[PDB]
Structures are given as structure tokens and as C-alpha cells.
């Protein structure tokens, strides 16, 4: 698998593109390609300041994580959907959310099951702390 099947970039309108798929954690069901993401593609509802989650293909997965036993079904990078901070493990992400953003209740698309294969790519939760503590626990 080297193409993001079923997902099309919302800027260049290209489907089954090759590379890093970009999913907005506040912005509903809009996705970006690597080229459009690096070009600062912005719309009336989406801005470059939106927290940003990255999902790879299987070829991209074993290219990026070459030498490790991690698989596509085990995402390893999750973005802080309020903060813009990125590269948190599941435990790291839940610790960050509990510590720095305990009282934040803005609606977000949570990075984990959005990037998890077979999960909900646009799951909406007003309490992402409840997301991380209830169903998103390892």
C-alpha cells in the first residue's frame, strides 16, 4: 500500500495521492497532501495554525520506521489538537492533555483513532480528555 485510498486532498483535489496524508484535528473531514501542506494551502475555514495530524501509507510507514517492528495499525505520532504541539506518544499525549489543557473543552477531531486504521477519521468529542481516558487507553 503506497496510496491513501479513499482520501483526497482538499486543496489540489487529488485522490489516492502518494505521500503523507494530513488530517485537520479541528477542521471537519478536510485533508491535505504533503505538497499542498508544505505550500501553506488555506481555505475560508482552515488555517495553517490548525493542529495537524500526519498519517502515512504502508510503503511510507516502512520507509519512515525502517528497522523497527511498529506497524501501520500502531500509530506513534499524535498532535495536540488544541495546542499545535506534535509528536506525542499515547501516554505522552494524554499526559499533556491532562496537565496543560485540563479545562479546555473546545471541539476537536482526536488524532489517534483518526490516524488509526479502521477507526473514525473524523470522530468529534467535546471532551478529548474523556476520549483519552475512556476509550483511548492502552
Amino acid at each position: 500500500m503506497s496510496r491513501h485510498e479513499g482520501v483526497s486532498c482538499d486543496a489540489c483535489l487529488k485522490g489516492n495521492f502518494r505521500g503523507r496524508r494530513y488530517k485537520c484535528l479541528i477542521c471537519y473531514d478536510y485533508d491535505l497532501c504533503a505538497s499542498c501542506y508544505e505550500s501553506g494551502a488555506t481555505t475560508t475555514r482552515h488555517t495553517t495554525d490548525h493542529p495537524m495530524q500526519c498519517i502515512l501509507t504502508r510503503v511510507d510507514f516502512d520507509l519512515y520506521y525502517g528497522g523497527e517492528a511498529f506497524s501501520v495499525e500502531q500509530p506513534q505520532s499524535f498532535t495536540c489538537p488544541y495546542c499545535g504541539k506534535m509528536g506525542y506518544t499515547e501516554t505522552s499525549l494524554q499526559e499533556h492533555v491532562t496537565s496543560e489543557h485540563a479545562e479546555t473543552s473546545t471541539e476537536v477531531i482526536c488524532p489517534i483513532c483518526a490516524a488509526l486504521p479502521g477507526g473514525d477519521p473524523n470522530h468529534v468529542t467535546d471532551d478529548f480528555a474523556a476520549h483519552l481516558t475512556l476509550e483511548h487507553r492502552a
Binding site: 519512515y64 506534535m86 509528536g87
Partner: protein, 149 residues
């Protein structure tokens, strides 16, 4: 050309309390994972961003000041290894024929600027697939008393 002493890294200690990240790398990996693959051999760090990607190196120890860095590249693919890197406004190319270590000692001003955080830009590789590959990144520094902070 800032001529550095060859024995510079002899007068500096490798640092394990260093965090690695950056939105270019944090998209694919997490900070603990980046630290693990930059402090160990057999595995690497990749980034398919054309033009290069930025690594944010943060110091978790307030008693230690950054003085230089060393990057191991070429173990996986020489083509996927980057052509050049840049830091603190200084750019040096990576002409690679095999796996090796590249050094970059910091000036006193650069060391002062790298007290807590620093940014290292890495140019895109010559790989036709557009994959930039860096195997291991080791950072060196000295205590504030020794550095004369």
C-alpha cells in the same frame, strides 16, 4: 571559515538529557522515538518533505550548554542521505560516498544561543523518491561553569 580545534569533541561530553522533535519530524514520529533512534544504531529517521526538514533540539538540563553535534548518515541509503545541512546560519554540504559521521562544533556565540533550544535544517536528499534519511544524531556540550556562562 571558522577553524575549530580538532580535539573539540574531546573537551565535550555526550549528552543523554536531550529531546529531539520539530513539526517536520513530529508529524511522523514522537519525541521519545526520535531520541531513541538518534541515540541508537541499526535504525534511522526519515522525512519525505521536499527541500528539507527542521529538527528542534531541546536541552532539559539547565546546568549544561550545547557545544557541538555529530550526525551519522549513510548506513541505510547514501542516495536518501541529505545533500547538505544548516544551523545557526551556517550551511555545510554532505558529499557522501558511504556511511560516516559529520561533525559541527558550535562557536561561543552559537553555544550561547543554544542554551535551551536550537533548530537544525536538513536539505532534501538526491533520492528520486524525495526521502531525507539521517541515522543517528549525538549532541555534545559542557557544564555552565566549564563553559564560563
Amino acid at each position: 571559515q571558522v577553524t575549530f580545534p580538532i580535539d573539540f569533541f574531546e573537551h565535550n561530553q555526550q549528552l543523554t538529557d536531550v529531546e529531539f522533535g520539530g513539526n517536520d519530524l513530529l508529524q511522523v514520529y514522537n519525541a521519545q522515538q526520535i531520541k531513541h533512534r538518534l541515540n541508537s544504531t541499526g535504525m534511522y529517521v526519515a522525512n519525505t518533505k521536499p527541500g528539507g526538514f527542521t529538527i528542534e533540539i531541546s536541552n532539559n538540563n539547565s546546568t549544561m550548554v550545547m557545544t557541538g553535534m555529530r550526525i551519522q548518515i549513510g548506513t541505510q541509503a547514501i542516495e536518501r542521505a541529505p545533500s547538505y545541512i544548516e544551523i545557526f546560519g551556517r550551511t555545510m554540504q554532505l558529499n557522501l560516498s558511504r556511511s560516516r559521521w559529520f561533525d559541527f562544533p558550535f562557536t561561543r556565540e552559537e553555544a550561547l544561543q543554544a542554551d535551551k533550544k536550537l533548530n537544525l535544517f536538513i536539505g532534501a536528499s538526491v533520492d528520486p523518491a524525495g526521502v531525507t534519511m539521517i541515522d543517528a544524531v549525538k549532541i555534545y556540550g559542557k557544564t555552565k561553569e566549564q563553559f564560563g556562562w
